Amino acid sequence: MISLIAALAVDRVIGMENAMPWNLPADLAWFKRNTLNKPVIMGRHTWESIGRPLPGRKNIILSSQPGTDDRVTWVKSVDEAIAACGDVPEIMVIGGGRVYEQFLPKAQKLYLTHIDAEVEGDTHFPDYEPDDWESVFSEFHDADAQNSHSYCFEILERR
Amino acid sequence: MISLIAALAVDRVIGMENAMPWNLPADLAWFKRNTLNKPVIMGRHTWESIGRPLPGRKNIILSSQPGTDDRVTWVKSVDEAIAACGDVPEIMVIGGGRVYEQFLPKAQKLYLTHIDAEVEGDTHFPDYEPDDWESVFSEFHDADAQNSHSYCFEILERR
Ligand SMILES: COc1cc(Cc2cnc(N)nc2N)cc(OC)c1OC
Ligand SMILES: COc1cc(Cc2cnc(N)nc2N)cc(OC)c1OC
């Protein structure tokens, strides 16, 4: 099935700028934990922004432009992206905003990190209509030495 | 013992403006649940802002000015406020920022609502040094019909 995994600042803002509120080591450990040994689909900006292949995962870049790295798979369509995942229990869509948009209607599961931090972004995680989605897990953490804002992991399943 | 209970927007902003992010019915049910059959200490602005006595609780207003309502107790000092609570298991300090400030060093427990909402306030909940405080409970809720932002209840105990 298709899952989206995303880090949200307040007002559901997202961004892939390296250091920021998107550098939270705890968010990156949670990302790693929930994507290892799964295919990841990402848009080109998310690929540029991570700037290396994610090891232990098949990396699929959805882009209208031709590929510039042979260590990952490049595709032009959401159907091509899905087909390149093969027969697997779970496909992980890892951003950015355009990619989240085109995969949400097909997704059955959301892994969200609510980061208790203010960013101006103008680029938002898409509108998951609460009537369509059931929260099944949440886990709050305080700010600590490594993690300079509080955050909350949430998993939602589609009804 | 002395507890603080407070609603925080991002950056630990607080405010007592009626409708706002401080109108969250769920935050008000949680406030009621955790303060019923306890004394409440508040500053004058919090008293003006609530604009009625809280029933089922002894209401103590800490103010340098003389009292203007006989249904509540008025005092001039934190010691006077504490003494007017009598022998009770738990004293609840309900704001505002000046009152939170002068009671934090004496508090052993914090009831915080983290509201996932942006407000400009310039008036902040005080710095609870994470090394002094242990989170023992947290409970995330999604935005719903009644509650127009996600929120998280947290209880911390002093080490
Ligand atoms: C693995 O490294 C990164 C991964 C991501 C995507 C991402 C990060 N966190 C969460 N929860 N969901 C995601 N989709 C974003 C990044 O930039 C902030 C990364 O930089 C290290
Ligand atoms: C009982 O009514 C109110 C109470 C408060 C204080 C308050 C409200 N919520 C929380 N969690 N802590 C508090 N100290 C603040 C208020 O204004 C927003 C109230 O208006 C109804």
Numbering used by the authors:
A (entry chain A), B (entry chain A): 1 to 159
Give me lines lifted from the publication on this model.
Two plasmid-encoded dihydrofolate reductase (DHFR) isoforms, DfrA1 and DfrA5, that give rise to high levels of resistance in Gram-negative bacteria were structurally and biochemically characterized to reveal the mechanism of TMP resistance and to support phylogenic groupings for drug development against antibiotic resistant pathogens. TMP is a selective inhibitor of bacterial dihydrofolate reductase (DHFR), which catalyzes the NADPH-dependent reduction of dihydrofolate (DHF) to tetrahydrofolate (THF), a necessary step for the recycling of reduced folate cofactors. Trimethoprim resistance in Enterobacteriaceae occurs almost exclusively through the acquisition of plasmid-associated dfr genes that encode intrinsically insensitive DHFR enzymes. Expectedly, all three enzymes form the stereotypical DHFR fold with an eight-stranded β-sheet, four α-helices (B, C, E, and F) and three catalytic loops (the Met20, F-G, and G-H loops).
